[PDB]
């Protein structure tokens, strides 16, 4: 699931707004019908916040751990 979890929201390139940054991403959209943010926050990023109107994602603190999981995905799907 982890190699498809990040895909579930960050891989929805269709997204209308996204604030990618050093260790901070964001995903302001209405495709929440069934999104796995609850997983994409502790598994894709390191803490996100949902605010009807926009969504914010933060891969700080345990950035290396989460990014390590990211590295695994491309290596698992290379």
From Swiss-Prot:
Effect of residue 21 to S: Unable to be phosphorylated and to catalyze the phosphoryl exchange between glucose and glucose 6-phosphate at equilibrium. Remains susceptible to CdiA toxin from E.coli strain 3006. Still allows binding to Mlc
Modified residues (Phosphocysteine): 21
Stated induction or repression of this protein's expression: Induced by glucose. Expression is positively regulated by the cAMP-CRP complex and negatively regulated by the Mlc transcriptional repressor. Mlc and CRP-cAMP bind independently to the ptsG promoter region, and the action of Mlc is dominant over the cAMP-CRP action. The ptsG transcript is degraded under conditions of glucose-phosphate stress (due to intracellular accumulation of glucose-6-phosphate caused by disruption of glycolytic flux), or in the presence of (toxic) non-metabolizable glucose phosphate analogs due to hybridization with the small RNA sgrS (originally known as ryaA).
Residue span(s) of domain PTS EIIB type-1: 1-76
Cytoplasmic compartment residues: 1-76
S-S pairs: none
Top-level taxon of the source organism: Bacteria
Localization annotation: Cell inner membrane
Effect the entry attributes to changing residue 23 to A: Decreases Mlc binding
Disruption phenotype: Disruption confers resistance to cellular contact-dependent growth inhibition (CDI) CdiA of E.coli strains NC101 and 3006, but not to several other tested CdiA toxins. Disruption confers resistance to cellular contact-dependent growth inhibition (CDI) CdiA-STECO31 of E.coli strain STEC_O31.
Residues at the active site: 21
Effect of residue 19 to A: Still allows binding to Mlc
Binding partners and assembly: Homodimer. The dephosphorylated form interacts with the Mlc transcriptional repressor. Mlc and the EIIB domain form a complex with the 1:1 stoichiometry.
Task of the protein: The phosphoenolpyruvate-dependent sugar phosphotransferase system (sugar PTS), a major carbohydrate active transport system, catalyzes the phosphorylation of incoming sugar substrates concomitantly with their translocation across the cell membrane. The enzyme II complex composed of PtsG and Crr is involved in glucose transport. Also functions as a chemoreceptor monitoring the environment for changes in sugar concentration and an effector modulating the activity of the transcriptional repressor Mlc. (Microbial infection) Probably transports the toxic C-terminal region of CdiA from E.coli strains NC101 and 3006 across the inner membrane to the cytoplasm, where CdiA degrades specific tRNAs. Toxin transport is strain-specific, mutations in this gene do not confer resistance to several other tested CdiA toxins. Probably also serves as the inner membrane receptor for CdiA-STECO31 from E.coli strain STEC_O31.
Domain notes: The EIIB domain is phosphorylated by phospho-EIIA on a cysteinyl or histidyl residue, depending on the transported sugar. Then, it transfers the phosphoryl group to the sugar substrate concomitantly with the sugar uptake processed by the EIIC domain. The EIIC domain forms the PTS system translocation channel and contains the specific substrate-binding site.
Name of this protein: PTS system glucose-specific EIICB component
Organism name: Escherichia coli (strain K12)
Organism placement in taxonomy: Bacteria, Pseudomonadati, Pseudomonadota, Gammaproteobacteria, Enterobacterales
Complete-protein stretch covered: 401 to 476 of 477
